Amino acid sequence: IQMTQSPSSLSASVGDRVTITCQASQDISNYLNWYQQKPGKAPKLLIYDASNLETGVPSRFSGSGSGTDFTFTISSLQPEDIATYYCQQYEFIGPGTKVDIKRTVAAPSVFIFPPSDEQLKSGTASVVCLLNNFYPREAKVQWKVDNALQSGNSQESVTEQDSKDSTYSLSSTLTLSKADYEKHKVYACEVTHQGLSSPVTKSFNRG
Amino acid sequence: QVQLVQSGAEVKKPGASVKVSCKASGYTFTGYYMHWVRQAPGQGLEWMGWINPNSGGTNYAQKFQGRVTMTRDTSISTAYMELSRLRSDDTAVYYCARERSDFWDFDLWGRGTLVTVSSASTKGPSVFPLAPSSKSTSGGTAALGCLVKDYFPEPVTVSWNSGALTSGVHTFPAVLQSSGLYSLSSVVTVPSSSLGTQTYICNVNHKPSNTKVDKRVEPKS
């Protein structure tokens, strides 16, 4: 038995109506509950038994459905509603729907940081590319060394959507040994984002 | 008021056991089924099982059959979830939750307990500067930061200028590297003018290893 939620994620503007759908692979019950989980916090019960608003939860939240088809609606999206929403029927829990706030497209400010002497002396080099204050979340960072595309070489991390300005920031780290580092000359990160007319490349020459 | 209070974070080798407690406060502990739900980082919720605190009866998801044991001590209103023969992929935040009614509407949740399971052993981070330069400055804004690398387990805290600096600070979620060690970055954006007039220092604290490091971040010369 599988619970399906649609869509997997969505962006909507403040004041928008948001509808999330939950579907059971097979009939389970008319009893379905919806939970909201904000980043860093425990899940919180919002709707129980398909359509009942939990006491103390704002009236903009509602739910409907029966059989295998259920919906959860936020009538008017508010900034504090950024979270992941989950449906549940007994042991079965949906994969969740992430909601973020839609805003004006913002191009990231792209910055690059060479490895520190401290790190090199320890035998490793980490090169960091920073994309700051962008929207939407979707972004592509790829590393080039002497113009050779890298793979299996880097990891990235993205912040939660900021509360004051609704942006994201992204940090990407390319790591390799000092021995490997000193083989090549040019280190570049190539950034693609809706807010950039064409990809941006930020790079430096070792030494 | 009415609360579920969970025990603190755990760090475990594979094959160890972990026992997480959940204390019920302000309501009749024996009157409600207590469930356990877990969440691996970056993933969804996964139901594990329940216990009936009144009778002691338990029911577990098949996945955990043979490895999980749920128990209660009615005398202190506390439920326990013990998971044995731990696997690295048991790494998760473990929640207790109260079943309010036969809806299985989980109205009350513990704050969660992080359980990290890894072959890794505790290790303090190395803190390297992310030096500001012409490649981290544009439009009158400079970015700088610290790389906090190769530590285990989570979490670490990072502050800037002993907490004097808060605006423009972004401390990123750590990544789990191919080494099984965590690495994270904390950066701050500042008026680029202040690079010539202000000293910037990141204060890194890794309490699991009792490591405290302050790192001056100089502009690259």
Residue numbers in the entry:
A (entry chain L): 2 to 208
B (entry chain H): 1 to 52, 52A, 53 to 72, 72A, 72B, 72C, 73 to 100, 100A, ...
Sentences from the paper on this structure:
As exemplified by VRC01, the first such bNAb to be isolated, VRC01-class bNAbs share a common mode of gp120 binding in which the VH1-2*02-derived variable heavy (VH) domain mimics CD4. Two forms of designed gp120-based immunogens were subsequently engineered to bind and activate germline HC/LC VRC01-class B cell receptors: gp120 outer domain-only constructs (eOD-GT6 and eOD-GT8) (Jardine et al., 2013; 2015) and gp120s modified from the clade C 426c Env (McGuire et al., 2013; 2014; 2016). Here, we present crystal structures of inferred germline VRC01-like Abs alone and complexed with 426c-based gp120 immunogen cores and compare and contrast their gp120 recognition with structures of mature VRC01-class Ab/gp120 complexes.
We also solved structures of unbound 3BNC60GL and 426c.TM4△V1-3 (at 1.9 Å and 2.0 Å resolution, respectively), and a complex structure of a 426c.TM4△V1-3 bound to 3BNC55MAT, a mature VRC01-class Ab. To evaluate the structural plasticity of the inferred germline versions of the VRC01-class bNAbs, we superimposed available structures of inferred germline Fabs in their free and antigen-complexed forms. Superimpositions of bound and unbound forms of NIH45-46GL and 3BNC60GL Fabs (this study) and bound and unbound VRC01GL revealed no major structural changes. In addition, superimpositions of bound and unbound 3BNC60GL Fab showed no major structural changes except in CDRL1, which either flipped the backbone conformation of the Asp28LC-Asn31LC segment (in the case of one Fab/gp120 complex in the crystallographic asymmetric unit) or was partially disordered (in the case of the second Fab/gp120 complex in the asymmetric unit), thus avoiding clashes with loop D of gp120 despite a four-residue insertion in CDRL1. In the mature Ab 3BNC60MAT (and presumably its close relative 3BNC117MAT), a disrupted β-strand in the region of Pro61HC was reordered upon binding to gp120, but no notable differences in the bound and free forms of 3BNC60GL were seen in the counterpart region, which contained Ala61HC instead of Pro61HC. Root mean square deviations (rmsds) for superimposing all Cα atoms in the VHVL domains of bound and unbound Fabs of NIH45-46GL, 3BNC60GL, and VRC01GL were low (0.54 Å–0.73 Å).
